[PDB]
Amino acid sequence: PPGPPGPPGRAGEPGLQGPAGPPGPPGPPG
Amino acid sequence: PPGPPGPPGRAGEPGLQGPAGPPGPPGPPG
């Protein structure tokens, strides 16, 4: 009498955007 | 008769956080 398990769930949300990158290199000398 | 199937499962875990951004624009001259 107990039925089979239901269908699988949906694939999860896409992940959070990554953090901002490092600062660019220091500029050339003045 | 056997019971009906269960409901659909839960959604998967969200994706991992993406990679870090590229380096910022280069610094200006000194």
Place this chain on the structure above:
Amino acid sequence: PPGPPGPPGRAGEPGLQGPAGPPGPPGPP
């Protein structure tokens, strides 16, 4: 009686790459 709820879905896609970093430090003199 109805069956147990289905298994969990697969994990999500990884996230987008972050934005560009801060503007670089100005150079030496």
